[PDB]
Symmetry: C3
């Protein structure tokens, strides 16, 4: 295996783009949603847990997520990237770029949880939760889906992390909101816009190469986001009598989340439909407690996107086609099972992480 | 034709960069220029018409702009990108990337109009105008210049859209301001800075490849922007006795607009001269009604850049050279004719789009 | 020598990223640190001196920095990029891209000085200082380190500009603060986040190619930044009893500065250690007059990073290995000598630039 420098270049820039999604995208997103007096402490928690994730990732996280082991975790042979030759190749890129790309996914997933709950949670408590949860939820689920583990080995389809990122974080957020118990819309908009732009590295980069699947993922991201903005805004216009900015921004996130598992597997007709459905699903979600509506958008649209990936991957619907020997009904069942496993896995581990913080330092911010 | 993955990578990142120019660049630019109480509604209109453009682009816009047809429009054989193989190659990149790149140009052009006028226009009215105007002005002009139509076939020079983007939008904006009848400078600056960075994807990406013409376009963008900042600020310092931030930011946009048609055709000596002249032209423009000075900068500097492309493309002036058999005088005439056609075409269609909104929903915001 | 289009693409995007660091990164960083009433004038000075640097760079700066001459400066054979064929290749990229990449380093270095002092300095005075200082400090030091001059020829290690950018600017800033005599933390955070993302083009781009050294520089940037955030925040938590946002952001800059000279030469274990030490060094620095703590972070962490590059480059410590015939003790001595030369060179020239402004227009803002 030799590294292709074009893919190297692509994947380094895509990594910078996914890092951009956390620092400052999600921070500004939540920054505009929470009360003014809580913004500074939230930005600090997002910055510091971000740093924590990057360090834990390189120390053991990448090895346990991406090393070969069992169905659930990898190994500890790549501690501090030991035994990874600088010139080692993973896919068509230097493995070091693969480390950085996959790490940036860990970052945004944790950022999604921490930004939503930072307002409510004690600082030392969130550090404890991130350690437990990254280690016991993010790493194994990443392994199961993208490290050749359980879900992958059953053919689960999840191009860029409807399960690993979105449902995983949504449930952890809901569990936290439950245990624990917009001031600036131009900032919300700015954070959303940065998330949007970053999400091209997230979705297109998940191809691992600057090929036609990256191209397809890129075009589907544009399409599903636009469709979800319009779906949300129409639903809002039909219901409230007027569109709002928060609605437009929420619609955009909804489409982005919806298309995340699907983007490299579906055609543009499917991205449009997933977009519309995700935007309206998101609107339904937030209408029907959910901290900064993390689940209403990431959770509901994550589930919707994962299921619809099992439909719209079909050749007959413009997608790339199911794997050899797989029917739509079989794929749908695998998508459903993948979503169920992710919900229970993340829920149990988040519960454990939050309880441990609470038993040691106390959860609620003094 | 085989896709080069280096060009694939380059052009996907350049597309993300041009998308960045609208979401959030132009939105923050206008956001800082208009009254505080109008900002939210403007951001909503920019976000939603952006979404609309992306959807119309993939549904029929790309096909009608880039399909082969006549001198004025393409065809409807690529509706929803039907009959475009995923592995289809356009130039040296996957055609799907070409769709996304060209679409992002449609977005920023509409963003330039909608951001300037959102404050004044009814929401449903702007949706109507965007449909009419994208379909009947943007698409045909894109076709004429970049889809092998009228202007291209006469050898018009317009590397990145002095006519298609800048003059097109400026006139539509002026027509709207006429029919219809800075609060936050750090936001203006931030929007300008984002437009600047995005504009590297806009200008250098227009080469379609990461070659020496992309390199040249990139260097000319840096140079013409810097020269226009200094030209504007000196003119302002000579006139008002002091430079201002809005002046510096306007100077930057002026240079960027000026160099847009020229950047891949001229040498750095020419970029410097175009820069200075565009900055001083911009300053003159805004000095001598023009909504958020859209025309004073995009219109005047667009015309100036298009004309000066017909001079500075000459080999003798450091440019790449006129096409075979073309003299400077002949090229100048083609540039002038291209500008005239674009002004009248955009003006008539914007008038039609605004009148239709006004006859159906009413133009002015209740 | 033929240009590799993958490296072309990479290096054009990296240049856009470094430009992003100034426009708007450092401007927003300082914008949030200085009093509200000084922000507009500071943003104007950053924008205009940025433009000035870009123009001086293309006119003579690139030629005098990167042309072949003596140990201290290049030549004037590339005035306005004359005698540089468009298809000329430097390393594995078109030389025009090398011009733009190196120019963007000049920009951020000047931005670091001007942003810190703009509040205090007369506008015409800063223009004078930038001309003198770019020409007589930045250019020769760039030449000595990266243009085959004195420091390079003695084997100084400085991957991305611990000396050329960070120490150079810190000293110029200290000299200015001496001669001359946070309002918005979400803005500080946003500027820091943009600096962070841009810094991937800065560090990884300094490889000049999308190879395994770019990959290594990229991963070390993530690691050293995260380690420095944690180092600073722990030191702050140990001292003040609580972490702060300004602390977290300062920690990030500290790590980024620290790893700058080292990132392409060290392993991830070394990046972690440099990170921690840089964060704690930065915290010590700002604790023990220093305009917007430019030296406390850029100066102290620059020195720390340059020294630690002479340790952590060793094969035995996970680095790439010292050059043939070089021991750790010899390398350390060269690092120390490089830092001393840079401090004295920049100090003397900044003194001269500030005195000349002061004798002609007066330094202090009326």
């Amino acid at each position: 295996a030799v590294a292709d420098k074009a893919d190297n270049a692509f994947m380094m820039i895509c990594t910078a783009l996914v890092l951009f999604m956390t620092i400052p995208g999600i921070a500004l997103f939540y920054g505009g949603l929470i009360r003014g007096k809580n913004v500074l402490s939230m930005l600090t928690q997002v910055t510091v847990t971000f740093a924590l994730v990057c360090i834990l990732w390189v120390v053991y996280g990448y090895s346990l997520a991406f090393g070969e082991g069992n169905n659930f975790f990898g190994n500890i042979n790549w501690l501090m990237l030991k035994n990874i030759e600088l010139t080692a190749v993973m896919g068509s890129i230097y493995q070091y770029i693969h480390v950085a790309f996959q790490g940036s996914f860990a970052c945004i997933t944790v950022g999604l949880i921490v930004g939503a709950l930072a307002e409510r949670i004690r600082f030392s408590a969130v550090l404890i939760f991130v350690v437990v949860w990254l280690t016991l939820s993010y790493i194994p689920i990443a392994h199961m889906v993208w490290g050749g583990g359980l879900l992958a080995s059953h053919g689960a389809l999840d191009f860029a992390g409807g399960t690993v990122v979105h449902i995983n974080a949504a449930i952890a957020g809901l569990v936290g909101a439950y245990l624990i118990g917009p001031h600036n819309l131009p900032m919300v908009f700015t954070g959303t816009a940065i998330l949007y732009i970053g999400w091209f590295g997230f979705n297109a980069g998940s191809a691992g190469t600057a090929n036609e699947i990256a191209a397809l993922a890129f075009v589907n991201t544009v399409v599903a986001t636009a469709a979800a903005i319009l779906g949300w805004i129409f639903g809002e216009w039909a219901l409230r009598g007027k569109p709002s900015l928060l609605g437009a921004c929420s619609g955009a996130i909804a489409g982005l989340v919806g298309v995340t598992p699907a983007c490299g597997y579906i055609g543009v007709g499917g991205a449009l439909i997933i977009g519309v459905v995700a935007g309206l699903a998101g609107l339904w979600g937030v209408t029907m407690d959910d901290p900064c509506d993390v689940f209403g958008v990431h959770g509901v649209c994550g589930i919707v996107g994962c299921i619809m990936t099992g439909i719209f991957a079909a050749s007959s619907l413009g997608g790339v086609g199911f794997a050899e020997g797989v029917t739509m009904g079989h794929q749908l069942l695998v998508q459903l099972e993948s979503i169920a496993i992710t919900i229970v896995w993340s829920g149990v581990v988040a519960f454990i992480g939050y309880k441990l913080a609470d038993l040691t330092v106390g959860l609620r911010v003094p």
